[PDB]
């Protein structure tokens, strides 16, 4: 709700991981919810993330040019592996 989730594609760089964020919002003229995409750059000093993982972002003071976020784990998920 507050922060933005995203997929962590292109995690090749050192101490950094490119992240793809997705959101839906209604079109102002026609009122249809369109899936828009926007990328960001975050940092994981432990390098605990790799491509294929699910990651959450947080605001922080700027680390470099265009890298102004911090990668954290997700809060609310629905794994629920094999519940009755």
């Amino acid at each position: 709700m507050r922060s933005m989730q995203g997929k962590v594609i292109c995690a090749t760089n050192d101490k950094t991981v490119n992240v793809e964020v997705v959101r839906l919002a209604p079109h102002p003229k026609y009122k249809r919810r369109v899936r828009k995409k926007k990328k960001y750059q975050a940092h994981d000093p432990d390098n605990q993330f790799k491509v294929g993982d699910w990651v959450q972002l947080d605001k922080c003071r700027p680390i470099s040019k265009t890298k102004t976020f911090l990668a954290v784990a997700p809060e609310g998920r629905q794994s629920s592996a094999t519940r009755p």
Partner: protein
């Protein structure tokens, strides 16, 4: 059509077809006349209608119409042009103002006196 096609901006408006490009949006515009003459109108009508080839200060060479009865204009005269087109004369899309820099009011005219720049009798 499909709403996905609408998001492609399939629809656009139509642009203006303004009928006085020479004025550049202004209501009137000054210009010197180059060659006064007459011309035969379209086939059904028949007359020798008066016109004037004008060089406006906005960078456009055009021709106008001489409304009214009688005129004193000649080459090297300064007139004042307005809009309005004459359908009977193809190509003419402007009128001059009577009662201005050099074009004088129509002689012996009482009705519709403001459209020709003529003093009221007293």
């Amino acid at each position: 059509p499909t709403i996905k096609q609408l998001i492609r901006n399939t629809r656009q408006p139509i642009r203006n077809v303004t009928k006085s490009p020479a004025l550049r949006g202004c209501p009137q515009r000054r210009g010197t006349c180059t060659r006064v003459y007459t011309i035969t109108p379209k086939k059904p009508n028949s007359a020798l209608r008066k016109v004037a080839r004008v060089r406006l200060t906005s960078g456009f060479e055009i021709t106008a119409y001489i409304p009214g009865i009688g005129h004193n204009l000649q080459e090297h005269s300064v007139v004042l042009v307005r809009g309005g087109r004459v359908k009977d004369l193809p190509g003419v899309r402007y009128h001059i103002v009577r009662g201005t820099l050099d074009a004088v009011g129509v002689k012996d005219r009482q009705q519709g006196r403001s459209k020709y720049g003529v003093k009221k009798p007293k």
